[PDB]
């Protein structure tokens, strides 16, 4: 039961800010602000997490999406982060991500960036 | 404006079924049923898509998450698909995905599978 | 023992041409010619494969790299394909790949594309 | 020209040891010893790097493969790392990797793990 452990404000290694609420039902809702790329201000996110994780010391699996459209800009792209929450004194969300841009069929080979973000509760 | 083009029932190459509604606001909601893996019946999904895509022939970026917990089972894992919708006679959603399982810190190197799913409106 | 099954000329879905020799010792050597991207003519490749695969119907794991420098151009990038060879009437190499471009530290978040290529012995 | 900067012994965050020689011609040769997984002792590697990188502060793209067969064991798998070398006082190779295991056609959806390794010249 990591609803309280997940909910809150998280920061990654780029200085991006992830503001999330975890629902009792497994939902993730909030906003993402990227420190880099074709982005400004906050963007909607949604996602899901395992609301009944294993009790053996394993992390808590979760994921979320941002489409990079808001009232300021549209980067015609979406990122998905997939990862796990690891609780404790220095809690962390360890993620890998896929960023797809909309492309023509001819350029679709080149549509998707992959990377990895680690989030902490301290900047 | 691909709200009508996205909304509906989609099937991938594995015979999985993706049932989605696209909101005017960029939301994706629905259910996923996997034909493979530690899964049975339907699981909640949510996600986002570019509600104002480019008009140059590019695809429509989107993503969504499933956490693999429902009333039947809990696979302590989450998958994120990231991709684009390509409209037309044979419409398609072309995706890559990341499946993270909850692990101990010692096994976290091995936590994440990557793959690729192509969805069609016909089985 | 898939040395004879791997060695030869392969083509992917983009119309790229992969010319490989598999060594008894697990080596892969040859040349790659991409139909797309910042590339022309042939580039050196090397890689490795499992020279003693399982006999249970499993595929044969393998991988290879291309750095995108030759006498014509230098795209300051390297792609790695990781996958498996599946023997038989319609033999295939099913791969996923990572293409890293050299970046400054500020842009390294955006350095790596991911995709998937399927190779056949017929175009 | 990073031939001297790449050649040598590198260690990642898992305590794996990567011993590589960079050739003037773009080759990478050496041995890999994993601290984790179905592995013991050293395994052959080969790969490629950009021997004429940009002079603007960008990193040096490179990649390499290991098939996880040696005289001790065979894990019927191959990993490819794709990344860049970043020179200087605290030199680093920043990589993402794809590990494919040989599978039956029914389980091929689950064949490939993805992760990220950072190598340093100090443990």
Curated annotation (Swiss-Prot), chains A, B, C, D:
Family: Belongs to the avidin/streptavidin family.
Name by which UniProt lists this protein: Streptavidin
Disulfides per UniProt: none
Organism this protein belongs to: Streptomyces avidinii
Single GO molecular function: biotin binding
Function statement: The biological function of streptavidin is not known. Forms a strong non-covalent specific complex with biotin (one molecule of biotin per subunit of streptavidin).
Residue span(s) of domain Avidin-like: 3-123
Chief location category: secreted
Gene Ontology annotations for the cellular component aspect, listed alphabetically: extracellular region
Subunit structure: Homotetramer.
Binding site for biotin: 32, 43, 81, 97, 109
Motif residue range(s): Cell attachment site: 48-50
Keywords attached to this entry: Biotin, Secreted, Signal
Annotated localization: Secreted
